[PDB]
Symmetry: C5
Subunit: 206 residues, 5 copies
């Protein structure tokens, strides 16, 4: 447990080896989740890259938040992909929240406090509880098989995770800096393992 308030991980150059593993304390697989984070990179108009990689032994892309070059955000649950297209590329730190619900198949994707349209993905599915959660790289195996061309060059912080769906009002307060209590991953009480060229500095965003 580390309090990472006002701190962010920094991956200053492209690599195959720099990553942070996030220790999720769980048993019950997930019928729903919400993932929020800040990140900052210039890669957006040169190549794709992995924002948040959640892998299980049977599924490498169990939850994957990814950026596809000339497309926008790619959201994947259980190997199935949905896109959140972005016409114009923004050059500044970005806060995203994303949720998915098994019961309904509804995914929500929130960019800088503003919501994209609701979409459907993996209705009735269950996300596995024994996971390998990675920042800075895209998993192709449980905890490994990284590709440098999918690596995050930049900052990533305020990563949080819930095992239910956040409401629009709740997302609004997280974004506005208000109080909250995540029950899967907590930035303020995070367990983690650093590997490779990655540093802990003060966050660049306000």
């Amino acid at each position: 447990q580390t309090d990472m308030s006002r701190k962010a991980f920094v991956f200053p150059k492209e690599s195959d080896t720099s990553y942070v593993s996030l220790k999720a304390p769980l048993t019950k697989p997930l019928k729903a989740f919400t993932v929020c984070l800040h990140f900052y990179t210039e890669l957006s108009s040169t190549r794709g890259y992995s924002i948040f990689s959640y892998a299980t032994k049977r599924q490498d892309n169990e939850i994957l938040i990814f950026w596809s070059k000339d497309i926008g955000y790619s959201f994947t649950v259980g190997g199935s992909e949905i896109l959140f297209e972005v016409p114009e590329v923004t050059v500044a730190p970005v806060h995203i929240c994303t949720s998915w619900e098994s019961a309904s198949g509804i995914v929500e994707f929130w960019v800088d406090g503003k919501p994209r349209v609701r979409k459907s993905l993996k209705k009735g599915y269950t996300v596995g509880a024994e996971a390998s959660i990675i920042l800075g790289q895209e998993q192709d195996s449980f905890g490994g098989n990284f590709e440098g061309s999918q690596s995050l060059v930049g900052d990533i912080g305020n990563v949080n995770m819930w095992d239910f769906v956040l409401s629009p009002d709740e997302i609004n307060t997280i974004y506005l800096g208000g109080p909250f209590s995540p029950n899967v991953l907590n930035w303020r009480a995070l367990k983690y393992e650093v590997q490779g060229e990655v540093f802990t500095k003060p966050q660049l965003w306000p």
Copy 2:
């Protein structure tokens, strides 16, 4: 009779079976009406869709609020169509109000509280009272004959209906969040039948 305050219908994927049917004890025939609603979809740049379908046994498009690809808003009364071109599209939730008056034929269209030009459509006409009112699909027959290529993928909410033409100040009240009392369809006292892949969730718009 359900209080749908702060909630919206969610049509998270394309189909020809998902819809909501709105019910009312319908009074005398209509010599005028106003219908206001919020909706949010990403379909505007890809194909057309139906936003509000009001059908009678005699006319499948008795009142139709439609979006027409590369053109803009389509507003139909008694089978006759009028257009409100929209040069660039906004990728955000949208609030609309629209009215028609039999006496003058005057049609109004309001987008996020701002009025379009007043136009003319079906003067002397009388809108049928025995009707089938549908969200999510375009009627080609009374209560049916939907087309998937005309389905709404997204959210729709705050649907209200009056049997008279709202003044500009009254439209202002509706849009700014003031209290009001609609006399045909009331989102706070909504009587409806849900069908296929439709969800009730908290509204995405303020």
Copy 3:
């Protein structure tokens, strides 16, 4: 005699026969004037139309506020026209004031409270007092000879006329709301005649 406060004239479709005739107490040739009005149309990027037509038995375009397609505003006094070009069109209600002073020849044109450059037109000319003043049509003879290709389709209101040149501070209050007393045509004490399909409804602009 009629108080037209907060009400506008509505010309909902193209026609040869819909117009309003404005009656002024007027009885001394004009050596100067000012005309202010509000109008709203979509015709601007399709064809020209007449905003304010002041005909005299010897001159059909004695005063004419007109929109020329792909050019901008046209202002004519005693048959002589000058242009106020607009590179880009606004799709919203628009408030205009315009003045002319025989003594100097100076013409002013104000759009949404914002002045164009001062220009010169018909210095030392005199504007006739016996007049036919028409909204919705362009006159080619005292009180008639209209053409549908020059008709106003939309809303026009807040029409006021003075017999002297308003100052910049005076136009500023006229545009923002303020009190004023026009001495030729008064929107709050207006005498008029309606002809054809033209309607009185609440104004769309604040």
Copy 4:
């Protein structure tokens, strides 16, 4: 001495005969100065024009503020010219302040209270104090030899001149309209001489 507060000289059309002559109580050869003024014109994308023409018996272009078409502002001291390029022209009234210092050669150019870079011009030169100062025309001789194609068509006012360089804070006050006292040319106590078709009217800018 006339107080020209809230008033401006109007040059309604093109001519080589319309101009205002400004009377300084001039004194000793100047080794610094600052000139501020408001002007409004539409000639900007058609031709150039003189804004401020200061000629001495020996130097016709002793101080000249000019607008060069397709380029921007042209500032000339002692016959010697420097440019201030303007990529995009705006059609609105504009306030400019310019200064020059002999000791350093430093020229300053201010447009709407915002400064252009500092530039170098005529270091160690002295500006003749026995001068003819003209508005609305460009001098090619002491007090004459105008050219119609260099003529200002539009309004010019708020003309003041000091015999020293104004600081950034001092300019900011002038631009904001704060209280100030010029010692060479005072708009509030102006001695001038009008010739041709030029009119005094209320200023069009705030």
Copy 5:
């Protein structure tokens, strides 16, 4: 020790002879530094120019802040360049802070108080402390070999340097203007040497 508060060095025109030499209490090797300054120029779209030149006997480009035509900001340390692309150029005064840390190799670049992404440069290297610090000119040798082609035409001011990396909150204070004390170069206690055509005038920025 001169307090250069509210003042800037002005380089009115291109040359290879005008420069300012900054003098620092010649301490020990730098394992980290931060440099902050204001500058205002119009050269960005015509050619590249040197903002801040820090040169040792061994290395001509020991710390070099530069502007590269059609590229953006060039930040170089111990001969290794890193780029910060700027798609669109702002013709206004600009405040930058840059920092480098040996331990991590992380560089930071801050434009008008907004951070660019963290990049990597010269990890483990050490910046020499026997230095020549020049404004207005680019060094290709210790205190010499200037190319007018690389000279700053404009204003430069509020130069401050620290021997450690400033935090995000610290940089906000420097940009918004709060109180601070730099330990390498203090603009409020500056020792310097002026050469050529360079003057001291009031700063143009707040």
